[PDB]
Amino acid sequence: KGAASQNWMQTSRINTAEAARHRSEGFLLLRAAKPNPAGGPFKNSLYHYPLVWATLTAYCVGDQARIADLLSQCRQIGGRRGVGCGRVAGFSVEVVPEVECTWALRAMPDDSEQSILCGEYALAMSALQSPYWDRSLHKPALVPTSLA
């Protein structure tokens, strides 16, 4: 992190006066008398996610040319890309000696060999192949403690 993490705040709300006007004019078919900001169609919601300035470095085994070509079309990193978070100023792909840092800092399968693991590995539930948010694909896996 080039700077401390910033807690970013975003909300969600349907304009109640605009909806009332549409309800009056027949654009909206709602018979309910009042909006409910606590829940339902007109719920106001408050959520937060952290924003960080960072340089993304990771290690892999593959083709330099093809990986560089794939990363050429990448414009945004991480998530919340619809609101423009994590634009890519640039990228670099370099060949480095194996002794620097291994590719093991990831979700390895449960019975992975100890010799290839860099550092401590805590057992947890995570997916081994992308997509990683699919909870039906979640399996017990060794997740690096010094990276989570």
Partner DNA sequence: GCGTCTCGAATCTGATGCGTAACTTGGATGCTTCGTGCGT
Partner DNA sequence: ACGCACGAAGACCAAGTCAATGCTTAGTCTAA
Do 61 and 93 contact (CB within 8 A), yes or no? no
For 40, left (φ over 0), alpha (ψ -120 to 50), or beta? left
Residue 115 interacts with DNA (CB under 7 A)? Answer: no
126, 134, 136, 25: which is closest to 147 by C-alpha? 126
- Which of 144, 86, 92, 141 has the alpha carbon at shortest distance from 119? 144
Give the per-residue contact string, 16-35, with DNA (x = CB under 7 A; - = no): --------------xxxxx-
Q: Which stretch binds other proteins (CB under 8 A): 1-9, 100-108, 124-132, 138-146?
A: 1-9
Among 9, 65, 99, 148, indicate the residue that binds other proteins (CB under 8 A).
9
Site residues (CB under 8 A) for other proteins, limited to 87-146: 87, 89
27 lines the binding site for other proteins (CB under 8 A): yes
Site string for other proteins, 45-64 (x = CB under 8 A): ------x-x-----------
Q: Which of residues 34-73 bind DNA (CB under 7 A)?
A: 34, 36-40, 43-46
> How far does Cα 80 stand from its chain's mean position?
7
User: Which tokens sit at 114?
Assistant: 């100890």
The C-alpha atoms of residue 91 and residue 56 are separated, in whole angstroms, by 9
Report CA 144 to chain centroid distance, whole Å.
18
Binding-site ranges for other proteins (CB under 8 A): 2-4, 6, 8-30, 32-37, 40-43, 51, 53, 75-76, 81-85, 87, 89
